[PDB]
């Protein structure tokens, strides 16, 4: 009947032709004009609307036409897809955010849009626009009344997904704009602990000094231990030199930290292992003394047990077995 | 002192077999049994002139050390590899180690011992099997080196060349009938090792020639140990033999995918929902779950027990991580 009609509205919107797009519209009724702007077309694992997917796509001129000239809500809600990762209930401002679509955020905001849109799990057009890492948008965004607040579903701050992904600048913008990077999520995961696994350095300088705390996380490790199960060294090492528990807590990262360059086999090491793993057995006797209680021997690890004294670890220098051994048998009494 | 023990040895090392000649002529019997069976102790290394220069490929050393001085070859000593510093290395283990198939024929056709044990019981073959020159390892073994030969955890000259991603001289093991049943103190076997790496090529060897499926001392099946290690690629050809009617098969198909969220070098949530969803589609066909209790290290979230809950966090990025590891936590622990 009319339906094909929304089919061929898409394509235009979609693909960009805005000369095509007038075309259709134009000498038609409004009530038709919004079924055929309004119209949930699926395609591409992406259900959107006109505007949702211009704006995914990013074709500016089609987007004003549809904005300037057409009345759009600005608050349509789609299912659109990205990289694999599929998001409900966002508006073309998050898809525009998401993809960097500057233009379209600054037609899409200025031409009226809630720069604090809640998708199905709360993310708010700052999420998309720092999990992609275009601090461009994100201070026009916040500039232009954004939350930095906001969280998600599971409480994942902009910053604590700018962090993940390792965008140091934007990590600084928002912590400038007072952005607290001591709130925690369900798991029990701050900003900190993210950066630190994810080997981002550049990040835990600018978390330290801007009164980032030492929170421990639903699984019983501070940031420093989760970069230390991380093989993560560079972290490790700056975080060693602060607030660290000393002996009790500081050796076991050093414990952990060697493990972990075993248990990889696409990080692994061993040699770093025995340096991190010796290291500690000194300082866990260097004056008294802070023994170990080493789990009992079991059949995964050879029957054998772990090292308690800096003696017996030298003697599995010369035991590439032992030491592979070793690592595992020392994380499986960290980890659990 | 005799630091001309300490020249002497310089030589050997260096290979200037030239050097070498001249430092040994004129010396007398005593002298000569003195300076070549001298232990010098070189940068992380403890190791006589003949020692060093079967190390170092030196043949012209090492034939000069041989054919005009009656050495014996049996002289032990403590080399190093990369970090890995073995003890009671004989000169025939170095060359065997490091390549030298030249100075490896020099050694043998002049009677050194094929089946040496190193400190921790290395055989100089298992040192080939580690460095993968086919072109050694079949020599050794035309000579005699004997493939049974395990290290001090019964390690197979098979196990560490299907570690070390050698299929070429895998192949050529099995087909001088080297047990791939073999198995190590951790309980593995040759195809444990196969199925960690990605090493696709020998587990299809292995697999020729009947390998049995077995559980390491870790509770792992090769099977289970590719899913741990999101290994899909030999899950997949692994899986087109037998496993527990359904229950193997999920196991490994719901470990592999969750491993894919958790491994940060081959993520892919993608591929994690992918494998996920196979499981509960191949459960739901009744084989149930049971689910572990909701932990705060995990959100609190309760791992998903029928496909609508699993469909339902599809457009959820938290929860597909956050499942991941939920599914891991159940499944190895
Ligand atoms: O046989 C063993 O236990 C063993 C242990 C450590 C290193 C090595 N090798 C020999 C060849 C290259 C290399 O790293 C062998």
Avoid at 66 to 82: A, M, S
Avoid at 96 to 114: D, M, Q, R, T
């Amino acid at each position: 009947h009319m339906e094909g009609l929304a089919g061929y509205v898409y394509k235009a919107a979609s693909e960009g032709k805005v000369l095509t797009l007038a075309a259709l519209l134009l000498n038609r009724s409004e009530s038709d004009i919004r079924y055929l702007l309004g119209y949930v077309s699926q395609q591409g694992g992406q259900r959107s609307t006109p505007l949702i997917i211009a704006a995914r796509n990013g074709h500016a001129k089609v987007v004003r036409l549809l904005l300037e000239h057409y009345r759009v809500q600005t608050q349509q809600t789609g299912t659109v897809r990205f990289d694999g990762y599929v998001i409900d209930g966002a508006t073309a401002l998050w898809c525009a955010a998401g993809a960097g679509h500057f233009e379209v955020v600054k037609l899409l905001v200025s031409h009226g849009a809630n720069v604090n849109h809640t998708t199905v799990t709360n993310s708010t057009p700052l999420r998309a626009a720092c999990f992609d890492g275009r601090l461009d948008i994100v201070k026009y965004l916040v500039e232009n009344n954004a939350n930095i607040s906001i969280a998600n579903k599971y409480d994942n701050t902009c910053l604590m997904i700018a962090a993940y992904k390792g965008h140091t600048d934007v990590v600084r913008y928002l912590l400038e704009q007072r952005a607290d990077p001591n709130a925690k999520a369900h798991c029990g995961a701050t900003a900190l602990h993210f950066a630190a696994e994810a080997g981002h350095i550049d990040i835990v300088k600018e978390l330290i000094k801007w009164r980032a705390a030492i929170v421990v996380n639903g699984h019983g490790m501070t940031p420093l231990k989760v970069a230390a199960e991380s093989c993560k060294a560079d972290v490790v090492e700056l975080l060693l030199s602060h607030a660290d528990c000393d002996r009790r807590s500081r050796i076991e990262a050093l414990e952990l930290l060697g493990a972990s360059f075993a248990n990889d086999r696409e990080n692994y090491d061993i040699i770093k292992t025995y340096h991190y793993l010796y290291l500690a057995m000194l300082e866990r006797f260097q004056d008294g003394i802070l023994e170990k209680e080493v789990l009992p021997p079991i059949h995964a690890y050879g029957n054998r047990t772990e090292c308690r004294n800096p003696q017996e670890l030298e003697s599995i220098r010369q035991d590439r077995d032992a030491l592979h051994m070793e690592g595992l048998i020392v994380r499986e009494r960290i980890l659990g």
